[PDB]
Amino acid sequence: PGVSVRDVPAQDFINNYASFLQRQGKLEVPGYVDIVKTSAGNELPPQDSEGWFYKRAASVARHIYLRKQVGVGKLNKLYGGAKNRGVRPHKHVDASGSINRKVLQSLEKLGVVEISPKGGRRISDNGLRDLDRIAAATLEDEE
Template sequence: MSMVAPTDSASRLLFVVESFGLRVIMTMFLKTETVLRDWCGSMSVSNGDLESRWKCGDFNMADYDQDEVVNGVTVRDVKPADFIKAYAEHLKRSGKIELPAWWDVVKTASFKEYSPADQDWYYIRAASIARKVYLRQYTGVGSLKKVYGGAARKGVHRQHFQKASGGLIRHILQQLEEMKVVEKCPEGVNKGGRKITSHGQQDLDRIAGQVVRA
């Protein structure tokens, strides 16, 4: 965009000052950009530099050894559906979760018409709950009832939101506690809430790494 030079003396002086200042700013910007690009290009490819390379716009997953990238992977780096599926399979293989006697007839909420059709639904819900607690510490049964709630049909009337079954969620949390994946919050923090344990965090991150490798 060209600048039109003014006619009077005062305006000319102001025009020269503004033009000079604009040139100085542009020169500093170009120098900064050059230094930044040189810095990004000179960095070694290590786990600590990946985030910086990404911020510099020079990150390509294919350029790096996948094992190096996986070392820093957490649950937040994996798509929810992929992680839940993988962790549910892990829970099923481990044999540490004991299915309740009513697992094949229970409904996950009172507004549901039928029980889940998937035979592995209990493991899937357990994996989903473990992920929720991982992402949000001190999550309780009340919060999870809202998360897994949905619209209750009222015939010709308007649908209304209804919470999910609290007994089912509580039963899953108790099983995850026995597996040392989650634990109850300290007294005075959030009564009935759970948080992820160090063992649980390592376990979930390990499964997330396996999802990235797959």
């Protein structure tokens, strides 16, 4: 009857997207991978190391698909959490913005994410198609 991303278990979809990205090789890794925090209020870099920036990218793409217009600050806000400030109560701290920006740039390069009027970023038609395909694949796997 028809498939879209909105109809898929989310985590699984994300995983699939990541896998696809890996297969491609195409994205542009800036080379901050295996050095950086992801969120500036964290005790550790990723517990996968080799990759998961792909995963992040996929997640971002999914988010974009879900919404209309998405920016960098917003992304940071979404992805950041509660920093342990010592013997002091926790606070919401925005994620590493540069990484997000890089991801966005990569997406743009690929042809998935597109700069929009008003401000921020939306989805490209090719990108949408790709997403749909991924969703379909996921569904098939589930079946």
